[PDB]
Amino acid sequence: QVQLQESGGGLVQPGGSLRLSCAASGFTLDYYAIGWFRQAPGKEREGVSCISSSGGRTNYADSVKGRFTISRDNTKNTVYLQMNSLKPEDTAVYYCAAWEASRWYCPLQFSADFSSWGQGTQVTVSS
Amino acid sequence: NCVADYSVLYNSASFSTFKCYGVSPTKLNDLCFTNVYADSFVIRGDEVR
């Protein structure tokens, strides 16, 4: 019953904005650290951004540094990825995944294995 | 006939599913058991459940 759902994708114009909602059912998403992932057609899965279980530690990718914003609502069991100043390079299907701390130290900038992969939403940027 | 520190495994995230039935992922290091058995195989994704 551990389900992750990606909601909020669509076709957007470059320079616009969009919001993603990752929904968790059947388990507590507060205890899990969440990191979004993208796999464009012909491209491998590159890390979007990672947020810890407590939300006090945030990871970002230099390709979307200063453009993609991550926030989580542990009360509502949802993690939001806010995207601004979109580019056609971001046209990819997006997954949100949950996993624990892989090592010592609080930040999770190092990638690791991911437990629950959602259905995913494809966000297309083209105009 | 040994000591196993399961906190090494659960706090390393070089793992996907900690599907522990009958025990909690964080309690194995605290408890003592008679004998442990390990099995291994490689499967597909959707069939993990």
Mark yes or no for CB contact A100/B11 under 8 Å. Answer: yes
Contact A37, A45 (CB under 8 A): yes
d(CA A95, CA A49): 11
Residue of B nearest to A2 (CA): B49
- CA neighbor of A7 nearest in space, from A97, A101, A80: A80
Residue of A nearest to B13 (CA): A102
Going through chain A in order, the beta strands assigned E by DSSP cover 3-7, 11-12, 17-25, 33-39, 46-51, 58-60, 68-73, 78-84, 92-99, 121-125
CA of A99 vs chain B CAs: smallest distance (Å): 7
- The distance of Cα B14 from the centroid of its chain, to the nearest Å, equals 12
d(CA A24, CA A41): 26
A5 strand-pairing partners: A23
Contact A3, A117 (CB under 8 A): no
A11 touches chain B (CB under 8 A): no
Q: Which residues 1-49 in chain B show a CB within 8 A of chain A?
A: 10-18
Question: Which resolution in angstroms does this entry have?
Answer: 3.4
- CA neighbor of A111 nearest in space, from A30, A22, A37, A55: A37
- Experimental technique, in short, is cryo-EM
State the maximum Cα–Cα separation within chain A, in Å, rounded to a whole number: 44
